[PDB]
Amino acid sequence: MRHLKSGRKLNRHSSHRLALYRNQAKSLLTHGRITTTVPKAKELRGFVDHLIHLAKRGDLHARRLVLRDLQDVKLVRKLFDEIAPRYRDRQGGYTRVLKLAERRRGDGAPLALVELVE
Amino acid sequence: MKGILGVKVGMTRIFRDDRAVPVTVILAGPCPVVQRRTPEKDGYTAVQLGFLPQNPKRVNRPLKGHFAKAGVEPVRILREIRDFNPEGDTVTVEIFKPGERVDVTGTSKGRGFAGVMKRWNFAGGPDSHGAHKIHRHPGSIGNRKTPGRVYKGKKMAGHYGAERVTVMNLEVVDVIPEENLLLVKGAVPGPNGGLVIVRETKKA
Amino acid sequence: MNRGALIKLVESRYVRTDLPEFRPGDTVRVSYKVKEGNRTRIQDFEGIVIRIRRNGFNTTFTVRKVSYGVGVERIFPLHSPLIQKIDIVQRGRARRAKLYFIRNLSDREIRRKLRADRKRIDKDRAAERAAKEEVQK
Amino acid sequence: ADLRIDTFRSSGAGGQHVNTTDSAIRITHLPTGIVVECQDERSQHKNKAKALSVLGARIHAAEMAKRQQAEAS
Amino acid sequence: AKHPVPKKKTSKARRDARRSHHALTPPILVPCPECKAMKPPHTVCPECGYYAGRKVLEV
Amino acid sequence: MIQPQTYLEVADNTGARKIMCIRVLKGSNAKYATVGDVIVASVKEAIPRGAVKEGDVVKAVVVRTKKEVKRPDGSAIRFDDNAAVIINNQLEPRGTRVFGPVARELREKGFMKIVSLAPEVL
RNA sequence: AGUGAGGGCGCGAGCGAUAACGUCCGCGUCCGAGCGCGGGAACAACCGAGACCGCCAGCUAAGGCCCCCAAGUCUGGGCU
RNA sequence: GCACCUCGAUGUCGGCUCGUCGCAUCCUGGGGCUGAAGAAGGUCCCAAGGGUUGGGCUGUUCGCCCAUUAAAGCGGCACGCGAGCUGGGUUCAGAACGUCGUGAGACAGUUCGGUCUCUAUCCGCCACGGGCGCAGGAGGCUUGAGGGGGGCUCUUCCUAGUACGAGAGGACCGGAAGGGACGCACCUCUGGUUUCCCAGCUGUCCCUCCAGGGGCAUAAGCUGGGUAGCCAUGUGCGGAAGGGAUAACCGCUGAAAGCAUCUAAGCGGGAAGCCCGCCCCAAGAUGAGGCCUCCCACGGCGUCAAGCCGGUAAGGACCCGGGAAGACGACCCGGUGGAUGGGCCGGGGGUGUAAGCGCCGCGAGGCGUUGAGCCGACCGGUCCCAAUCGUCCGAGGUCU
Ligand SMILES: [Mg+2]
Ligand SMILES: [Mg+2]
Ligand SMILES: [Mg+2]
Ligand SMILES: [Mg+2]
Ligand SMILES: [Mg+2]
Ligand SMILES: [Mg+2]
Ligand SMILES: [Mg+2]
Ligand SMILES: [Mg+2]
Ligand SMILES: [Mg+2]
Ligand SMILES: [Mg+2]
Ligand SMILES: [Mg+2]
Ligand SMILES: [Mg+2]
Ligand SMILES: [Mg+2]
Ligand SMILES: [Mg+2]
Ligand SMILES: [Mg+2]
Ligand SMILES: [Mg+2]
Ligand SMILES: [Mg+2]
Ligand SMILES: [Mg+2]
Ligand SMILES: [Mg+2]
Ligand SMILES: [Mg+2]
Ligand SMILES: [Mg+2]
Ligand SMILES: [Mg+2]
Ligand SMILES: [Mg+2]
Ligand SMILES: [Mg+2]
Ligand SMILES: [Mg+2]
Ligand SMILES: [Mg+2]
Ligand SMILES: [Mg+2]
Ligand SMILES: [Mg+2]
Ligand SMILES: [Mg+2]
Ligand SMILES: [Mg+2]
Ligand SMILES: [Mg+2]
Ligand SMILES: [Mg+2]
Ligand SMILES: [Mg+2]
Ligand SMILES: [Mg+2]
Ligand SMILES: [Mg+2]
Ligand SMILES: [Mg+2]
Ligand SMILES: [Mg+2]
Ligand SMILES: [Mg+2]
Ligand SMILES: [Mg+2]
Ligand SMILES: [Mg+2]
Ligand SMILES: [Mg+2]
Ligand SMILES: [Mg+2]
Ligand SMILES: [Mg+2]
Ligand SMILES: [Mg+2]
Ligand SMILES: [Mg+2]
Ligand SMILES: [Mg+2]
Ligand SMILES: [Mg+2]
Ligand SMILES: [Mg+2]
Ligand SMILES: [Mg+2]
Ligand SMILES: [Mg+2]
Ligand SMILES: [Mg+2]
Ligand SMILES: [Mg+2]
Ligand SMILES: [Mg+2]
Ligand SMILES: [Mg+2]
Ligand SMILES: [Mg+2]
Ligand SMILES: [Mg+2]
Ligand SMILES: [Mg+2]
Ligand SMILES: [Mg+2]
Ligand SMILES: [Mg+2]
Ligand SMILES: [Mg+2]
Ligand SMILES: [Mg+2]
Ligand SMILES: [Mg+2]
Ligand SMILES: [Mg+2]
Ligand SMILES: [Mg+2]
Ligand SMILES: [Mg+2]
Ligand SMILES: [Mg+2]
Ligand SMILES: [Mg+2]
Ligand SMILES: [Mg+2]
Ligand SMILES: [Mg+2]
Ligand SMILES: [Mg+2]
Ligand SMILES: [Mg+2]
Ligand SMILES: [Mg+2]
Ligand SMILES: [Mg+2]
Ligand SMILES: [Mg+2]
Ligand SMILES: [Mg+2]
Ligand SMILES: [Mg+2]
Ligand SMILES: [Mg+2]
Ligand SMILES: [Mg+2]
Ligand SMILES: [Mg+2]
Ligand SMILES: [Mg+2]
Ligand SMILES: [Mg+2]
Ligand SMILES: [Mg+2]
Ligand SMILES: [Mg+2]
Ligand SMILES: [Mg+2]
Ligand SMILES: [Mg+2]
Ligand SMILES: [Mg+2]
Ligand SMILES: [Mg+2]
Ligand SMILES: [Mg+2]
Ligand SMILES: [Mg+2]
Ligand SMILES: [Mg+2]
Ligand SMILES: [Mg+2]
Ligand SMILES: [Mg+2]
Ligand SMILES: [Mg+2]
Ligand SMILES: [Mg+2]
Ligand SMILES: [Zn+2]
């Protein structure tokens, strides 16, 4: 059973799966686009969404909230001062995922890209 | 054998004569007829009832043609209330008076591949005292060289639930004809959203 | 077809409003309708409310009360007709939603742990006494 | 008619034979109430023989005690 | 476990009989609306990096 | 809930202090006893010169549980201990007083005497 | 040379319990070695019968002749 | 007893798990007789549908006992079940007592210890798909041959303290209510869980000194709580009513045999049993059923192949977004003429007063801002993101 349960397991434990969503965020934000496996991507899209949407709030509290995960003060500045005001007019949906044609050789992992929109 | 299609919306208790009563609510009406069975043309009596409007932008030629003859816009699904022939062109919730007892059929929840413990309520092994990996196992399934086989219908692990099950003689508690609702003393099978058949009971 | 609202709609006809707000730690006194033999009457159960499990009309609460050496907890459906009234005897500053721990506490300890909630007491005797004022004549 | 005889598997040593052989015996003499078990030797029959023998001896000395608590009394 | 074991060499027929279902299905491709080179559907074209008629992946 | 081996405080002056249930009577194989049900229980300790002795097999009726009992009115009630009251075969209470409240369930069950003597129904 | 575990069935005896698909002798028989053929549903040794090879010929044996299944739903007389 | 299969191995007791059959019936159902007033009880007859408790002792089967019960039935199934578990017992090596033996050793004498083997090929069984068939092609809705499930029972009350009885006692029939056990479903209640939903805490390392936070202490560090979901201890509901054919049995009518006879012609009553009825599966029911509705002329000819081709029809499939569906397949919804998922917003709910700043206190802190902050699933809303665009299969209906 599993009925009506959101959120994936990704063959990781709690301690781990969380760091994943973070380092995946930290990378996505510092690069604007990254390539990951399909399901790893579909989880990540929600994560950076709340983070960014949070930075749209701009306040120091919100900033201290995002800081909890992103940890890097420098990155967080970039998120607030440059990433977010670009998204002021948009409400939710700051993230785009798209499946890639080439799976990766070593294991036939279907791939996809994840990027911030314009 | 009056009846109607509906959707199990949810449960919630109410109060009556200072007693609390567990109630599962069921969105019932309206249900337009689509075809009437008749011994002359069908070999028996029943009625094909529609429920929940369909988007004509999804209907196909064979279905639309069926719907046209009955003279009624598209609908989500059809089920037959056997041996019941209504005079109205639409069966409403009105057919049930608070007090009446009813049988409710609904597709049960789906446990998927289930263990013999959850399915058949087998005892399983002990959790201790030397049990080598059979803590939930079904144990013995037969004898020896006679019969030299396992009989049919041996209780064993498989898919549990997600199947038709009718719950008998349930009390109609209430009717909200203006909302097309229907209240029922007890618990109805399937999930909050499932298809259901409410029907006149067969107990005396 | 908001089945949610449908259910809450069904409930609406059984919803009460006449009841005071209260939080765990507050000491209350439910007047309950009971039946001794055949007759109807009112019985006052007064104790600390140790939990509230909110859930719309179906919300309920547990009151705990020592009674002749025996501790008794009792669970009341908040919107039952068998509740004539609920009087707030004394409001207290809890710290968590489920005061279960006081199941195992000396009265001296319950006392020290659940002190009087000055704010909600002050605001209570400020308001309502402000409502006694407004409806002059 | 008033004997109740039970057979069951003996206790202690014997290998597989002792495990699959209701060789032990128990006789209940319903009128009095005295009971004798016997899992001496391997044959059930011989054990019934002994038990039936002691059972007799035990009823006898019961009636002997009875006729004493009558005579002296 | 008392270590179960095949009682008879599986017949050459019954072997392949099992492998009845093992043959694979070809890939599903569409012509890319841009180049008309073949791509799996719902994926970004490897040739040009065009999807939804818009440019994305640089290639 | 009170199965065999369950202990209970006696809620009266029969001299018994704590009895262990050995059989719930309500039924030919019932799992558990609750408020109002009768259990055969054994006396596991008692006070000097009491009426009933220690180790007497006795009958008693459960007047309080730690497992909350439901009521038709939607309410429920739970005490802090499992308690009962020693009775004879005619189901009269053997004592004369009874301490600590009892559940109103007892009244319905027709235990009218026990209910009255109790210093509070709840 | 091989054999020197024999077996079944009928009959005559002992043993056994006027039990045993028991045992042990005698006479006989077949199986053994005829698990080749027909009958007895099936069945080593019961009934018929001793297969050199061929045949899209014939008569019989046992056992059968209503259908599975070859041949009488044959004739005459009784009983159930 | 025999020694016919198995010694190039057929694992032996008891327990546990799962049972299934027999009827010589323990209970409940029906009945005859009774030394049957009644309530009982005895014995026999019918009946295998269901039911047939929990503990003390012992490895124990057996048995004894405790408390119940309608009853605590007896057997078969390699004294069912060790490629299902156990390993207390038995049956290796150690060791000891009694005992026998000069002894080494030995004991249906006892005692303490003592390795039970991850992979299922076939049959069988529980589930679930792929192919093909269903002599036009499709979409829906069905019929019930056949099969499975279920099948228990107590107690009180009324009738009525009536018939019966000296009394104590105490019914038939008919009606009522509350129980136990079991089955199915369910999450409103009650109650669990809720691996990051909120909070508090210790140590330590880190960011950025304060403050605020982060990793780690489990694969949640610990603790206090906890929606949705899955659940029982929680909730509803089931066993039926009823119809038909019967068993033992009770009768009518009635010869053979002037009378009598329940039977030989013929007829009525009669069971928890049988057949229906209830629930579930079900047209591979190859005997492939039935109703409703949709689709169209083969386009070239195949000589013999009663079809060889190939774009289309109605429709279906792929792919994608998903799902109280699910191991995989399958099934269900949705795919821009769209709210399927994600985000966002709302509600619900959990936590229980964030941070920051102000105030009081030397301080630990407190108080205010403040039911604040955070806020997973549930109920909704919203095209911001993602189901883009596309591809493939599929009639053209053999005969009397
Ligand atoms: Mg793996
Ligand atoms: Mg957060
Ligand atoms: Mg690659
Ligand atoms: Mg449809
Ligand atoms: Mg069970
Ligand atoms: Mg279970
Ligand atoms: Mg072990
Ligand atoms: Mg929904
Ligand atoms: Mg109190
Ligand atoms: Mg007030
Ligand atoms: Mg004021
Ligand atoms: Mg015996
Ligand atoms: Mg005696
Ligand atoms: Mg395949
Ligand atoms: Mg007490
Ligand atoms: Mg139970
Ligand atoms: Mg003592
Ligand atoms: Mg009550
Ligand atoms: Mg007295
Ligand atoms: Mg009474
Ligand atoms: Mg009383
Ligand atoms: Mg009183
Ligand atoms: Mg020689
Ligand atoms: Mg003779
Ligand atoms: Mg010869
Ligand atoms: Mg030879
Ligand atoms: Mg021959
Ligand atoms: Mg031969
Ligand atoms: Mg002949
Ligand atoms: Mg002849
Ligand atoms: Mg003549
Ligand atoms: Mg021999
Ligand atoms: Mg053999
Ligand atoms: Mg054998
Ligand atoms: Mg058994
Ligand atoms: Mg009796
Ligand atoms: Mg008897
Ligand atoms: Mg007799
Ligand atoms: Mg003990
Ligand atoms: Mg023991
Ligand atoms: Mg021992
Ligand atoms: Mg009885
Ligand atoms: Mg008895
Ligand atoms: Mg008895
Ligand atoms: Mg017995
Ligand atoms: Mg047996
Ligand atoms: Mg031992
Ligand atoms: Mg041993
Ligand atoms: Mg050994
Ligand atoms: Mg041995
Ligand atoms: Mg030894
Ligand atoms: Mg010697
Ligand atoms: Mg010596
Ligand atoms: Mg000497
Ligand atoms: Mg012995
Ligand atoms: Mg030993
Ligand atoms: Mg391994
Ligand atoms: Mg067809
Ligand atoms: Mg078909
Ligand atoms: Mg049928
Ligand atoms: Mg049937
Ligand atoms: Mg009288
Ligand atoms: Mg009368
Ligand atoms: Mg009387
Ligand atoms: Mg998170
Ligand atoms: Mg710091
Ligand atoms: Mg801090
Ligand atoms: Mg929950
Ligand atoms: Mg239960
Ligand atoms: Mg019931
Ligand atoms: Mg009736
Ligand atoms: Mg009948
Ligand atoms: Mg007959
Ligand atoms: Mg007969
Ligand atoms: Mg008579
Ligand atoms: Mg009659
Ligand atoms: Mg007559
Ligand atoms: Mg006559
Ligand atoms: Mg006459
Ligand atoms: Mg008749
Ligand atoms: Mg029949
Ligand atoms: Mg039917
Ligand atoms: Mg069906
Ligand atoms: Mg069909
Ligand atoms: Mg032409
Ligand atoms: Mg030619
Ligand atoms: Mg899909
Ligand atoms: Mg907001
Ligand atoms: Mg709140
Ligand atoms: Mg905080
Ligand atoms: Mg909210
Ligand atoms: Mg989350
Ligand atoms: Mg969310
Ligand atoms: Mg969701
Ligand atoms: Zn291209």
Side-chain angles (χ1 to χ4, degrees), chain A residues 2-3 14-15 17 42 45 53 71 90 92-93 95-96:
Chain A
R2 185 210 64 76
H3 296 157
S14 63
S15 270
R17 184 173 50 255
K42 280 178 184 185
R45 58 175 172 175
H53 182 65
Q71 304 287 17
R90 204 179 318 244
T95 56
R96 178 180 290 117

Side-chain angles (χ1 to χ4, degrees), chain F residues 83-95:
Chain F
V85 159
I86 314 287
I87 54 189
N88 65 2
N89 275 319
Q90 300 77 301
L91 303 182
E92 307 279 355
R94 293 191 60 182

Side-chain angles (χ1 to χ4, degrees), chain D residues 8-16 19-23 26 40 42:
Chain D
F8 46 84
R9 275 80 69 83
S10 23
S11 293
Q16 316 181 57
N19 294 129
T20 63
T21 294
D22 296 82
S23 52
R26 184 225 324 269
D40 287 24
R42 299 172 191 260

Side-chain angles (χ1 to χ4, degrees), chain B residues 13 41 44 61-62 79 82 109-110 123 146 160 164 166:
Chain B
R13 59 140 133 268
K41 202 47 156 67
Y44 65 102
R61 270 187 167 91
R79 298 286 185 260
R82 167 74 157 273
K109 283 198 180 168
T146 29
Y160 192 71
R164 173 190 182 104
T166 310

Side-chain angles (χ1 to χ4, degrees), chain F residues 35-107:
Chain F
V35 194
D37 304 335
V38 273
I39 59 181
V40 165
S42 176
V43 186
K44 282 303 185 184
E45 77 182 18
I47 59 94
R49 286 167 315 275
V52 306
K53 322 301 173 179
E54 179 182 299
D56 312 0
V57 203
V58 285
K59 290 184 173 189
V61 35
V62 164
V63 316
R64 281 188 272 113
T65 64
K66 191 48 214 161
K67 174 66 165 162
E68 69 292 332
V69 266
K70 321 264 290 327
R71 290 171 197 246
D73 51 24
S75 90
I77 184 187
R78 159 185 64 247
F79 308 90
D80 268 344
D81 70 339
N82 299 308
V85 159
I86 314 287
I87 54 189
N88 65 2
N89 275 319
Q90 300 77 301
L91 303 182
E92 307 279 355
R94 293 191 60 182
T96 48
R97 307 178 51 194
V98 34
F99 331 100
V102 305
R104 196 158 285 95
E105 270 73 11
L106 271 174
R107 158 184 286 278

